Enzyme design. Structure first.
Site, PDB file in Angstrom:
ATOM      1  N   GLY D  60       0.810  -1.203   0.000  1.00  0.00           N
ATOM      2  CA  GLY D  60       0.000   0.000   0.000  1.00  0.00           C
ATOM      3  C   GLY D  60       0.855   1.270   0.000  1.00  0.00           C
ATOM      4  N   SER D  89       5.479  -5.997  -1.154  1.00  0.00           N
ATOM      5  CA  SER D  89       5.848  -4.576  -1.160  1.00  0.00           C
ATOM      6  C   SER D  89       5.964  -4.127   0.292  1.00  0.00           C
ATOM      7  CB  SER D  89       4.874  -3.776  -2.045  1.00  0.00           C
ATOM      8  OG  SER D  89       4.785  -4.429  -3.309  1.00  0.00           O
ATOM      9  N   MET D  90       5.283  -3.056   0.705  1.00  0.00           N
ATOM     10  CA  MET D  90       5.334  -2.639   2.098  1.00  0.00           C
ATOM     11  C   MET D  90       5.010  -3.795   3.027  1.00  0.00           C
ATOM     12  SD  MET D  90       6.576   0.169   1.493  1.00  0.00           S
ATOM     13  CE  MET D  90       6.919   0.560   3.201  1.00  0.00           C
ATOM     14  N   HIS D 114       9.637  -6.624  -4.793  1.00  0.00           N
ATOM     15  CA  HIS D 114       9.374  -5.700  -5.891  1.00  0.00           C
ATOM     16  C   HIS D 114       8.233  -4.761  -5.516  1.00  0.00           C
ATOM     17  CE1 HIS D 114       7.383  -4.922  -9.971  1.00  0.00           C
ATOM     18  NE2 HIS D 114       8.608  -4.481 -10.188  1.00  0.00           N
ATOM     19  N   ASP D 152      10.222  -8.650 -11.151  1.00  0.00           N
ATOM     20  CA  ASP D 152       8.784  -8.703 -10.927  1.00  0.00           C
ATOM     21  C   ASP D 152       8.385 -10.144 -10.631  1.00  0.00           C
ATOM     22  OD1 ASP D 152       6.116  -8.065 -10.859  1.00  0.00           O
ATOM     23  OD2 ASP D 152       5.992  -7.684 -13.035  1.00  0.00           O
TER      24      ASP D 152
END
Ligand SMILES: C#Cc1cccc(CN2CCC3=C(C2)C(=O)N(Cc2ccc(Cl)cc2)C2=NCCN23)c1
Ligand SMILES: C#Cc1cccc(CN2CCC3=C(C2)C(=O)N(Cc2ccc(Cl)cc2)C2=NCCN23)c1
Ligand SMILES: C#Cc1cccc(CN2CCC3=C(C2)C(=O)N(Cc2ccc(Cl)cc2)C2=NCCN23)c1
Ligand SMILES: C#Cc1cccc(CN2CCC3=C(C2)C(=O)N(Cc2ccc(Cl)cc2)C2=NCCN23)c1
Ligand SMILES: C#Cc1cccc(CN2CCC3=C(C2)C(=O)N(Cc2ccc(Cl)cc2)C2=NCCN23)c1
Ligand SMILES: C#Cc1cccc(CN2CCC3=C(C2)C(=O)N(Cc2ccc(Cl)cc2)C2=NCCN23)c1
Ligand SMILES: C#Cc1cccc(CN2CCC3=C(C2)C(=O)N(Cc2ccc(Cl)cc2)C2=NCCN23)c1
Ligand SMILES: C#Cc1cccc(CN2CCC3=C(C2)C(=O)N(Cc2ccc(Cl)cc2)C2=NCCN23)c1
Ligand SMILES: C#Cc1cccc(CN2CCC3=C(C2)C(=O)N(Cc2ccc(Cl)cc2)C2=NCCN23)c1
Ligand SMILES: C#Cc1cccc(CN2CCC3=C(C2)C(=O)N(Cc2ccc(Cl)cc2)C2=NCCN23)c1
Lengths: 174, 174, 173, 173, 173, 174, 174, 173, 175, 175
Positions: D60, D89-90, D114, D152
């Site tokens: 997010g 991610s986060m 990523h 990715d």
């Protein structure tokens, strides 16, 4: 939009043949581009035959209106401005920008130089001062008279506009 | 869109026969493809006669602005750029990329090289540096001066943009 | 769209044997590009065709339909990238005739694919792309596979080094 | 949301009484404020008892995730992180930020560092903050973190253990 | 939701050690189902839990989070299918304790998966499902793979024969 | 929703303490889960006392109707079904699946077993045959008579549905 | 919705304590279920204490209105109906369905038995005939008088409604 | 749509002058009416000259595809079908319905005869019409067609050639 | 819409030049006014020469269907009806309303006379009875038979529609 | 819209002196119908003019503008109803010249006005209604009270019933 004939033209193309450029409705970049294209075309056909700008506009995008103003100043032609209905905000700047002696209004038009209402505060006031200076130049009023007048949220009649220096002539018939 | 006789063209076709290419409004891929097609076409009619690019644009898609830029550099013709209204973000890059000595503005235009605030962070900065290098080359300012200036969320007058090297001539009349 | 002399400007481009691939590729873009390639082949089987590519990518099967038509016709095909060639865009750029794949200097090229069918079909399509890219870049499958995993763009000269294009052009040669 | 009795408590209130903080779904300012309020609350009850953070998140808002990260580092408590479903991610930054030796995943979770997809310089300043955070907690070099983040892809829990994001992959207590 | 005697009816179900999985599975459904499984484990590590499944499927990673929790806890878990168990629904049905996987007689069961991430990740997730289904049905990978390609539903008795469930129940035993 | 004293319940909680389960409106998964939870709960309070199912429903999702049906058959209790308003499509299957002798309608109800016009064609027919077999069993009509009747896009009165075997008693008063 | 106290009730719950059931607004299956639940509850509290139905309704779903009617016929209680504002379409059927002698209207109410305006043509007219028969029974008019009257698109005053047999009493004060 | 000169013609009018009919994108009543008008038109110009049908379609409305199929069979002309991109569902029925020996695909096309997803009996009556059509033109038995159609997958052109949907896979003229 | 060749026409104009009128898709008042305009024009070009009506339709507004029907009955021309794809509800009324002996289907068409499910109840039945009398008349079935077949929510094949009197010939190839 | 030979088909109808009133009536439809009527009158103020009506009604003032133009022009005006003529549609049908108001056999006709207009005061809505009462009385030759009672009834009439009531003169199958 209807077609007229001597040679067939839609009626707005027939107006261009008379050297009339219409500024109706809100002014945005697209209106300014079409108005500018016509002003430059008509100068190309003749450097000194007058051009007529019909203005019924509540105003619009400032930079687009200044683009029209700068083109009006640039061409050599005398430009007669005519206000029908109203000229508010940028519309009244274009009306007052016509050739001296040749700025007109029909008798029931309404004229406002008050400005309505993404960029920073410094830029909004820089643009505001450009308007102050254009209005002062064409009305022959002082900067201070312009600034206090634009602060009033109100319309003027053609004759008050004439007395303030936006207009030269109020009509009724030819 | 009005029609003009010369032999019947809408007025934007008539602009093209005068060797004028219009860059009005946001730049995207479809604006770029149309501008490119016209630049190549005008080159094919004559690789020597100047071409005039009329710019009133708040910017737009970076890669599409770079396609126009690369085409301007590719063709042989001198290119005169003219700013009316505004030339901001990619609009002002195209204005600065005119042929040297032939970059102009009308008096009330506003020019901004600050860039507006789906790809990765590395890619966004790679593009940004491509713009730094283009502006440094056509203004002949250093990379660090271009970098600090573009951080300023500002807008400049035509005369400032002349002193900075974005354009050459600020004109009021012919 | 302006008119030139009678001809709208995009029809004048087709008269130069230029076919434009601007924008997302979908089935109707592909139908129009294919119609144009086959038309130009019937005008001259041998005269080169020029493909102008500025595109973020699009539908894979639509991309492969254009690809298959490009390989089908007898003509040499010069590809030119302006702005960008991402995903299927860059497949069509790489698929021009050996020696005639070009870019202008500020273009961005990407072969990474962005993120309804079963998982097995998505992988089959992905491997068709690996084999197409390996054939026209002359890289091995492993190199293509590793490169497409990197979510990044290449400059024209790096795409030239990788084998996607042959020449980076600044002015008319 | 069902009620459980002991006193009546909605089930999420029961979890917090267990010293469990849930980080589910996208991270935004709202989620961060609630997570932070809970971490600070649990510290004030005891600055020694472990806190458990259950993470099932696609990521997010970066700044919101950094607010949580900083609070995690600020409090004195040991913090056990647990990944179920995914940590992307986060999400994966918070998982890797748990107390050393105390970072866990269930066996079928997927982990991605990523990052998906304000001015250009500010986007890279933020990305550099993430590189430094991942390098500190995984003990990889900056160069290894950057190359890994441009790929990715997801990792399995065992791969994420080798890389230094997690310490332990579980099946049962 | 009616109240029984004080207790809303879904909280009364939780008091019977029943956890409901009705409807599309997403991350918040999974967070609530997991909260409930861990709560019931803390009430009694050994007492059976009952999972009522009526679901068309849902997000794969959310499904696998529930799966991993089911395998994690010490409790035996009875699964019951009413209405349907499609896709991730039927994975959770098949994952109950050997011998305690049930269906009522008019249920429909499906293991075919319906039709954003890279193609390699979609296939990795698909193979995790193949391995889970192979382990709990006791079928070979090839059999699971071929069955999941068929877009069809099974009756309870055919799912029992395939190894998804142990018993088709009409009345209380 | 009004509250009633007995000791303060909303009126739908009060219905449940009377052993009444409401099936109003379209059937979907969330209606089915709530109806099932109440049937099991009432069974746990007593596996002998009858349960009353009040049905005013135009039908709904087939699998969700089949979940309710299977629960009705699973529990030990006698189940009285009552139709007011209408019982159409899955609504009328649940009405017919009441305990024999205990299926009722009020006088002005309308009953329809015709089914309304994402899965494969084989699956849609497999479901359809599951419904044929359920209706044949509770009405004691043959499969072919159930099949032809359900092809008729019709609606039947309470007295017709009694003669067909969908229900047992048509009542006006106690 | 405000709270009142002797014991605290929201005001609609206080109305239920007076044996008043409100039928306000368009009648759909949800309104009918809540109205039916209240009618059955109040009979449970007493078999013979009168129940009061307040009707201000433009009408609604026919089968939902017939479900309410059938429940009114089913309970033993005298039911007093009261029209405020209007009773159109199904609202007027419920008004006319009250216990004879006990159907009332306030003096400015409007009453319509005309019906306004997915199912087949045969079913729409079967429902229409059910309404014809209910209206004939409670007004003591012939089927033909009902059919011709419902064909007129118009409202009646309370006194015409009284004379036609929908109502017994027109009020003004207690 | 660009104009080509010979007389001025939009490019799609030029194709029809070539005896080419395009079946692109979803098939619905509108597409069917235009395709049918064109097939009948071309027959009236010559009932012997071949007609070419270019297919790039995900399928569409069954009855609309059957209207096209019947017209194809009704006209006397040989009909060459060509698949580019994909031929799925009704798409692949029209491709398989070309004149024998005259059914082609480009090399990277995808072909599917599984059908995606009015009363239940009518849905099966329609599906039975499709089984009979596919069996006639592929020369497979009904049982082979039914099993193949329940598999949710695409075929390559070579597989579709083995099965009897196509006769020839192309690369160049 | 593609263009075809003196003179050049869009292909739908070229259809009308062949005396073909298309009823494709849902029938509403504007489809009906266009089909009607085309029928009366074709009658003014030749009163005796056959007109061909191509029907691929799921039905539509009843009064608009009847307006086409009345025009078909009004003109002097023989009318051949052809069904491809489907003729459902009003579509199948127009198919059945062609000249006796000239009503056709291709082989895979589906035909339905069941009517799908603001005006009053009495008017809906008035209109339904008009449909019963038109179908009875052109299929030569009794009212009771038509009323019972229309209660069935199903489609017919071309051959059962032929046996029922809705059409005369199922054709696979030209003559 | 197809081309006949150049001539779109609706322009070919105008050459026949046919004016189409399809679908709802609003100010734009009325402007185009009035333009056509005055055009045809200027071509010949004696050749009959033909109004085709298939309409559910529409804005009252716009219907009345067409009515007044019909009464103003000198030509005989034949009205033809297909499909339906409801509300302002039936007023126009009834306003054709006497002896020349026709319907095809399955049309539906209604003079009930639906429960349009700028919103307006109650006295204005009744003033308009009484304008319609008078127009219908004059052209059907029924008394005001019969018109009033009849328009209270929410129902359609068949063509033969419309013929008895005085809304049309002729019901026909063929010519
Ligand atoms: C936006 C803008 C803009 C506004 C004011 C002046 C300029 C300068 N421009 C600069 C260049 C220029 C100009 C004038 C010009 O007026 N004409 C003749 C002409 C133009 C249009 C048409 Cl339809 C017909 C004839 C011209 N012919 C070649 C270049 N050129 C811009
Ligand atoms: C996107 C793009 C792009 C941008 C800059 C250069 C090129 C290279 N291209 C490369 C090819 C090429 C070119 C120039 C060309 O300028 N002309 C003449 C022409 C073009 C358009 C028009 Cl309307 C009329 C005349 C040309 N005729 C055949 C090929 N060709 C691309
Ligand atoms: C979808 C597709 C598709 C793509 C690549 C090749 C083919 C095969 N097709 C196969 C058949 C075929 C072809 C080529 C052809 O190129 N031309 C000549 C032509 C075509 C278009 C235009 Cl505008 C002008 C001239 C052709 N004339 C008759 C048949 N025919 C398909
Ligand atoms: C956003 C934010 C933020 C994050 C990390 C540290 C701080 C500093 N802050 C600094 C101030 C502060 C702190 C801690 C604190 O942890 N507690 C005790 C407490 C907190 C929450 C709850 Cl629900 C119960 C008890 C505290 N009581 C008064 C001030 N105070 C901010
Ligand atoms: C996301 C997630 C997740 C899923 C499965 C297992 C774990 C590991 N977790 C790891 C830690 C842990 C666990 C178990 C635990 O089951 N309980 C007891 C408890 C929990 C909830 C409730 Cl309502 C009542 C009691 C617990 N008390 C402190 C830590 N802790 C994660
Ligand atoms: C979906 C579903 C479903 C439908 C029909 C039967 C079953 C089997 N199930 C199987 C398990 C089971 C059952 C019954 C049960 O009826 N009760 C008692 C109970 C239930 C709910 C409430 Cl509110 C109160 C009391 C029960 N207590 C523990 C397990 N259990 C499923
Ligand atoms: C929909 C409906 C419906 C309408 C009219 C009659 C029936 C028959 N039904 C049939 C069964 C039945 C009935 C009455 C009943 O009035 N009461 C007492 C009661 C009800 C509600 C509340 Cl709140 C309190 C007390 C009752 N207690 C057990 C069963 N039962 C349905
Ligand atoms: C829907 C449909 C439909 C499909 C397949 C066959 C038929 C039968 N129909 C039967 C009638 C018929 C036919 C063929 C015909 O092919 N042509 C010649 C023609 C057609 C179109 C164009 Cl543009 C140019 C020439 C024809 N000219 C008059 C009648 N007629 C229908
Ligand atoms: C809506 C409608 C409607 C339907 C069925 C019959 C009529 C009666 N109408 C009655 C009047 C009438 C008619 C036929 C007529 O067919 N033609 C000749 C003509 C018509 C159209 C075109 Cl394009 C070319 C030629 C005609 N010329 C003057 C009047 N007139 C209506
Ligand atoms: C709104 C309106 C309106 C309706 C009914 C009568 C009038 C009066 N008007 C009064 C004026 C007038 C009229 C008739 C006229 O019918 N024609 C001839 C003409 C008209 C249209 C076209 Cl296309 C061709 C020929 C006419 N030519 C000049 C003035 N004029 C209004």
């Amino acid at each position: 939009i209807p077609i007229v004939v001597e040679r067939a033209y839609d009626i707005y193309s027939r107006l261009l043949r008379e050297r009339i450029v219409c500024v109706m409705g809100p002014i945005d970049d697209s209106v300014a581009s079409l108005v500018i294209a016509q002003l430059l075309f008509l100068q190309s056909e003749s450097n000194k035959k007058p051009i007529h700008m019909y203005i019924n506009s509540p105003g619009g995008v400032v930079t687009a209106g200044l683009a029209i103003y700068d083109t009006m100043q640039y061409i050599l032609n005398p430009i007669c401005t005519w206000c029908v209905g109203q000229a508010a905000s940028m519309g009244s700047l274009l009306l007052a920008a016509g050739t001296p002696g040749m700025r007109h209004s029909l008798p029931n038009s309404r004229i406002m130089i008050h400005q309505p209402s993404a960029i920073q505060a410094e830029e909004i006031m820089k643009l505001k001062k450009q308007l102050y200076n254009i209005y002062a130049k064409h009305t022959k009023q002082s900067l201070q008279v312009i600034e206090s007048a634009m602060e009033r949220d109100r319309y003027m009649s053609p004759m008050e506009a004439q007395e303030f220096g936006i207009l030269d002539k109020v009509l009724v018939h030819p």
